[PDB]
């Protein structure tokens, strides 16, 4: 259960792109969207709901 929890709770959000091609006429602002990386601290780990 713990293994599975950590696997669902300590992942990278893959993240797309705002104004990705193909885009609609206009667009104007093209910027990458960065999501969350992964847990780093020992705490972040002690967290994670089981």
């Amino acid at each position: 259960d713990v293994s599975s929890a950590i696997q669902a709770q300590n992942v990278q959000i893959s993240s797309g792109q705002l104004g990705g091609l193909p885009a609609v006429k206009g667009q104007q602002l093209n910027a990458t969207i960065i999501g969350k990386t992964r847990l780093q601290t020992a705490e972040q780990f002690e967290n994670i709901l089981l």
């Binding site: 993240s15 797309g16 999501g35």
Partner: protein, 51 residues
């Protein structure tokens, strides 16, 4: 030589003609290009970690 070849100018010619013949037939199969390979070899590593 020289003295040898001065009284043997056919022989003289023939050493010249062989050299020319050899070097001639070579011009027929040499690679041609602007410059020789004068650039440092580089090897490239690529991966994409998506997003």
């Amino acid at each position: 030589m020289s003295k040898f070849f001065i009284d043997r100018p056919i022989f003289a010619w023939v050493i010249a003609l062989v050299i020319m013949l050899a070097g001639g037939l070579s011009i027929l199969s040499l690679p041609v290009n602007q410059y020789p390979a004068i650039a440092p070899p580089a090897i490239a590593v690529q991966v994409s970690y998506p997003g």
